[PDB]
Amino acid sequence: VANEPILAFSQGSPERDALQKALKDLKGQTEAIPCVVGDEEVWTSDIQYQLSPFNHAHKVAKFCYADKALLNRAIDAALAARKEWDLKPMADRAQVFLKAADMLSGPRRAEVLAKTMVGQGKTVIQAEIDAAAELIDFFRFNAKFAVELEGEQPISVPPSTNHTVYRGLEGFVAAISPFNFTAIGGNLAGAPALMGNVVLWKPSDTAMLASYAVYRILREAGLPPNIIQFVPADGPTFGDTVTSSEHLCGINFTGSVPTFKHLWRQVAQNLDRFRTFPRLAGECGGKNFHFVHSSADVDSVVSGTLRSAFEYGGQKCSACSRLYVPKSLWPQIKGRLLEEHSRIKVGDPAEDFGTFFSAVIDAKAFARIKKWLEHARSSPSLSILAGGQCNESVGYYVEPCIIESKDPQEPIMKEEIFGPVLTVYVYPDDKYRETLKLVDSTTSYGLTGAVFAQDKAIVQEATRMLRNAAGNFYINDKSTGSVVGQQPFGGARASGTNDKPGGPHYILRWTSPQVIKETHKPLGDWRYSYMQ
Amino acid sequence: SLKVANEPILAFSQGSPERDALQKALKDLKGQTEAIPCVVGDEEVWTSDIQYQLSPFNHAHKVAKFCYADKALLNRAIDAALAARKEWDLKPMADRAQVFLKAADMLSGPRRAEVLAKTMVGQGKTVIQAEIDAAAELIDFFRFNAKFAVELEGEQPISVPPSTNHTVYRGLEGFVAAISPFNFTAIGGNLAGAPALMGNVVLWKPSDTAMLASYAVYRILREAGLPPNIIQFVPADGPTFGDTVTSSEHLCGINFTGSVPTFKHLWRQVAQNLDRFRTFPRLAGECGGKNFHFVHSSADVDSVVSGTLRSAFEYGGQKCSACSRLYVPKSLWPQIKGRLLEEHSRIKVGDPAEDFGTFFSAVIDAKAFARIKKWLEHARSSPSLSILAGGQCNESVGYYVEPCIIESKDPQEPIMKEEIFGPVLTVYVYPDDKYRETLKLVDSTTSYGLTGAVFAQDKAIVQEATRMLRNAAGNFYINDKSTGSVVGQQPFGGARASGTNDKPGGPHYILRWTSPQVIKETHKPLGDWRYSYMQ
Ligand SMILES: O=C(O)[C@@H]1C[C@@H](O)CN1
């Protein structure tokens, strides 16, 4: 398989016309999205709404929370379907995801793009690299990796033949996905299902519209009933219920560190009830850096940092939020950042394709980001250089904000904001090595980071010093935008278990291999010849 | 790339060089006690907590005197290992692999008799059980894991202009605690060695009852060039060791083989302390089984008998893979029962160093002897149980237990569910026409999922049983015994209560001990931050 092409959406292109039509189709619409258990559409009385981030008077979806009883019924029905699904040949399960990929690539591309734009506030290009390219690639590449894994077989020596069976996990997997990438939900539920597991998928409230579109495509591509249950739910209720089931065998999580730790501790408390040891996979965010050496190409520093810090409002686990600049380059980089900042358009991405990024996801995110801006107006070490405005009267709109910190270990240099907030620390050129150590030691995270430098010896030194500061490390490129099969994604420290979705080993977390030895001759006597 | 093959099993025939070498090594150990220190870096350290390892078949023979590391020494070993980790992790994978390939060659040749003899005298193994363990399996772990690790570096991502992508297989940041069991010398070498191969530093707590052979393996690794502070040799009280390593903010992994309750205890300790760790520790555990031999009416009776006798009673049944429940159809039970009882009477139990005619010897220690004796007494009191053969034991000289064959009328008797780790086989006879119902009982009776075998010559029965028993065994055998997996051929492990099933002996095990980093280097300027569609 090859990577899905990123379309250019030029004027008069087929994809731009198709997208504009899909956006027009959605403009005044609310979809009633039920829970799906097997083939049954289930409504509870716990009604919820997904709002359009840039126009929160527009309810894009009405959905409901599954209660404990519905979740337990979804577990029971999934468990009853698991054996038949696990016994299917790997190629037959892969075919579902390959057909779903082809649907997303072609006739459903505009739909999933438009639903990600209106429901999660993404611009055209951010929806294209997410709901199309990345999700399509997850499905195609994981299918390839899984079919290839069946060929990894042990040595056979006469008179015995050995065969490895890549079993699904026995039980069900709980998939808990975040708002910020439509593709991640598809992968968190889809990769375990591909490997023969059955899944309860709790999608993110703030991404329900696009998440359900993906779910329906999987069902239409041939996913049998009760292999993935579509079960929006209150977060704590969902976690309590699945960690209370004796049949839990895995959690595939992406979200906050505290939630992942909570789930981990619930599993540990309940170890005595489970039939097997559940497998927890988590990607938990980062406080990612762009580190600049005095030899860097300034124009690449500027555009790469503007994109990494502000695309999709900074709402990426991989977004740059700390920029380290040598004093000798600061007049250039400050001047260019501030001039380009004034050209950034924030607005409605469905109506204005000139928009660079739009509103942040919801009222909770808006309130959290505003608190950080108020902190930046209070702290003696912080100064807002540009931006700092926010307005939630129409959408949850936060202007891009550039802050300078005189303190390299200020809280704003350490804590994940998940908003369009970039903090810059200016270091003396002669304190370069000491500052590299600060990049490594300042935060608890280890997800992404970039070094900009045109000096080979400097790049080699920085690469060694930052070896554990980033699981996705970039030389002269921005810290966001990993591509399936090219940059498998994840990191350690507090950023998670680093199972590297997008690479060939991720699917191994969702299989429990069995080795069958068949002997084709009689065994003979139990004694040994040396005993005589 | 690396070309390796399994280590050949030697025959130990009369007059052979390996038989003469082993007899000399055994003679050299017979009257000896080795004083085994803790090793931190290159320093031999003694504490006041003196302990002894006894010869299981002659417990008046203290084969080793060692000591338990105290909490101060354990924390000093952590600090020193962490201070050595970055240099070791930055070594090329091929350079780390060379240590284990050299160690494997030493074990294969000049050190073979030493590690065999120490496993025999210290753990009670016969010649062949020591040979398949301390020689063949340990050598194979070192050679095959080295091959798998060198080849893993060639698993690289796609690059598209203008960028080049590379995966760096980093060791875990922190230290790994390796906690090994008494019953296989090879397992301790793998539990400590495989993480070290992948760039980790390790605190190795070996089993008290396997100390002599475990230290022999440790010395061989150091002689093969393992640098100081990469593996710390730290025998310790079990609870004290777990408390110390799970209290360190730098714990990144636990590689464990032993009991279910101990593994669960460590897992809960890590969860309790989650807020202090720099990263999320990785727990790997293999935790035993209650393994089955299932016989269909089409089975070859001779293979059933010899395969079950070996699986049930070799090394006294002290294997995580040993068969302890045998399911026999009523039609074959007369033939099988008579042959089992006849062959049972020919099984020699005795001193494995003095009598190479010994089939198996004493069990490992007084605690195992006491546990097995209580089960034998249960077999004499239960109305559903009857002892068909064996049943006696005697601990006056060694911890000697006869092989015992019990028939249960109840497929759910506690002796059909609980791991004894002794030479105790329980047989359940089922009506031929209930073989499907009985297969469901094989699958549902115990909490374990490690090994199992089906004996049948009917192809359809084999296929049917293979489907129904899919999750009853992670190592499944057709017309062969449930013990004796070979590295590279039957990667070993199972799920349910048997552990995390990381399959040591196969190509994926080492992936638990690496945390990959992907580096993207872009070779052209980035251009503008706007996109063309925005114009
Ligand atoms: O690198 C990035 O920004 C995206 C987010 C994750 O889905 C991984 N790829």
Ligand SMILES: O=C(O)[C@@H]1C[C@@H](O)CN1
């Ligand atoms: O299958 C067996 O009996 C041994 C025990 C483990 O070391 C794996 N190989």
